[PDB]
Subunit: 23 residues, 4 copies
């Protein structure tokens, strides 16, 4: 499902940003 | 599956909100 | 997939916790 | 079995762990 695939990419991005935001 | 679809929408929302919370 | 169903529930939970902490 | 979706699932579970530990 493209909605699930899109949420997958976004959740990967979210953790990257959250880690960078804590660094 | 409705639960996976719901979490997908919710994860999209989550990142939007978090980004805004930092801006 | 139990990983995907589990991450769905956990993702819903994470957003609920973020909102509560925000509110 | 989509590796994107499995990866994001694993990452989403870790994200919550980090958030909770950062909360506690
Ligand atoms: C909401 C999660 N980040 C989640 C992770 C995986 C991708 C999508 C759907 C579900 C599995 C739940 C988003």
């Amino acid at each position: 499902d493209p909605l699930v695939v899109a949420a997958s990419i976004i959740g990967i991005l979210h953790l990257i940003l959250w880690i960078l935001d804590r660094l």
